[PDB]
Design a binder for this molecule. Structure first.
Ligand SMILES: COc1ccc(CC[C@@]2(C)NC(=O)NC2=O)cc1
Ligand SMILES: COc1ccc(CC[C@@]2(C)NC(=O)NC2=O)cc1
Length: 435
């Protein structure tokens, strides 16, 4: 695997030991061969788990998620996917890693897609080796891969709203269930219905995952209600998955606004990862997977793949060359390569709007490419009337940095800035100049 020009897809089934067995073997061989190596974790939770798998191997953990005292002589670095792409974008020296290992390499966040594009292009140039670890490589068509233990698969209607009758199978179960929902708001309603029925429910989503996942270890629970973030190596001691088989799809409309379309079917890869939360223990056959819909190719035209092109167009590779998306997922976007390349000063603004601003890539790009500076928030208020953001069915309002109460009406409307209470609270703080 470790030879230049090699990209290996390590596509062992979910729970086959890619992280806990195979990775430490790859790392030992890399150190022996004096290959400067990066290991890419999708989350801080997985970074901390990798430290346990790799303990007493000389690895530099480029994350505050791990309390380790480094020797200073390690030639293996571990960081999050997003950290890797972040550091490529910034005026930060990133070594030209001889071996590039991505764990949970199906992750469809823009920074993960961009990282795959950058790494696979370095491999194609003959500069590096790479290993992509995932049970569900791009374009996988198999929602029902092998497992450590037999799974009971059942197609069933799954509630997506509070219910009073007709779903007794949901609450009659005495074990632990992981339930994949398409959105935070959707999960909140199902969680409230379960709580009212006497169940103990933990909710996970991208903003809370890194701190709420610990509750799955520290608290007794009956249900985890999770978005798609638990497709990325989240391990539960569960005996059932309930899968809506639904997601939201960010869609760029007329190159002018982003909507959250759907809910609509998940990809086969997503369905396989959701189901793959169970069937992991060969001593516990007959974990259940209850699924409420079919799969479809909903990654086609999904905003994350366009956003990954916006990132890759702004990463230096060699002279004016631009990294390509990883070939198996390159047709999910119709973009002109280089169309999003920014001049130095607009690139810095773009980066800051994503890092400190915490804005979606697409929205950071619209602001930066308009020649607006990071602290200039006038664009949050001068949009068209149809871009008015609502809070409890009346326009959302903030006090501007000038002390003026104004309706939130951004010039570019990205539905991800207000898809739930927490998102809108963060965007209100941004519009107010508070970060
Ligand atoms: C042991 O070596 C290192 C440890 C930590 C870091 C940076 C960690 C960090 C969190 N903070 C931000 O500046 N970048 C990152 O994600 C770099 C090297
Ligand atoms: C998949 O990429 C994304 C990147 C950023 C965001 C917005 C996060 C946030 C905190 N910042 C705020 O202004 N609204 C908010 O929830 C959503 C998705």
């Amino acid at each position: 695997m470790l030879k230049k020009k090699q990209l290996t897809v390590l596509d062992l089934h979910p729970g086959a030991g890619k992280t806990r067995r195979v990775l430490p073997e790859i790392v030992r061989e890399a150190i022996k061969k004096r290959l400067r190596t990066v290991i890419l974790a999708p989350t801080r939770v997985v970074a901390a788990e990798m430290e346990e798998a790799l303990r007493g191997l000389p690895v530099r953990y480029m994350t505050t998620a791990v309390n380790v005292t480094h020797s200073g002589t390690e030639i293996v670095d571990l960081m999050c996917h997003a950290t890797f792409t972040s550091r490529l974008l910034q005026p930060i020296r990133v070594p030209n890693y001889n071996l590039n290992i991505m764990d949970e390499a199906h992750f469809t966040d823009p920074s993960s897609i961009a990282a795959r594009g950058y790494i696979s292009t370095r491999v194609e140039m003959g500069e590096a080796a790479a290993i992509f670890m995932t049970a569900t490589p791009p374009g996988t068509r198999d929602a029902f891969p092998d497992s450590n233990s037999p799974i009971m698969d059942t197609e069933v209607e799954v509630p997506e709203r509070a219910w009073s009758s007709g779903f007794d199978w949901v609450t009659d179960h005495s074990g632990k269930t992981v339930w994949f929902v398409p959105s935070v708001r959707n999960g909140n309603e199902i969680a409230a219905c379960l709580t009212k029925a006497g169940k103990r429910v933990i909710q996970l989503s991208r903003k809370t995952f890194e701190t709420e996942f610990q509750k799955t270890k520290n608290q007794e629970w009956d249900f985890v209600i999770t978005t798609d973030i638990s497709e990325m190596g989240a391990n539960f001691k569960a005996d059932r998955v309930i899968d809506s088989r639904r997601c939201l799809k960010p869609v760029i409309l007329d190159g002018e606004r982003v909507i959250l379309a759907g809910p609509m079917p998940v990809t086969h890869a997503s369905a396989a990862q959701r189901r793959g939360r169970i069937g992991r223990n060969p001593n516990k056959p007959g974990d259940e997977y209850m699924y409420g819909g079919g799969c479809a190719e909903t990654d086609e035209g999904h905003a994350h793949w366009l956003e990954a092109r916006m990132l890759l167009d702004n990463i230096y590779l060699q002279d004016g060359l631009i990294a390509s998306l990883y070939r198996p997922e390159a047709d999910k976007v119709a973009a002109i390569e280089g169309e999003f390349k920014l001049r130095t000063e607009q690139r810095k603004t773009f980066v800051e709007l994503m890092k400190r601003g915490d804005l979606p890539v697409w929205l950071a790009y619209q602001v930066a490419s308009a020649g607006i500076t990071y602290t200039d928030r006038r664009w949050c208020f001068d949009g068209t009337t149809n871009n008015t953001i609502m809070e409890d069915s009346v326009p959302a309002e903030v006090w501007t940095k000038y002390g003026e109460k104004r309706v939130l009406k951004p010039r570019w409307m990205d539905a991800r800035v207000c898809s739930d209470h927490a998102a809108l609270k963060s965007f209100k703080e941004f519009a107010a100049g508070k970060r």
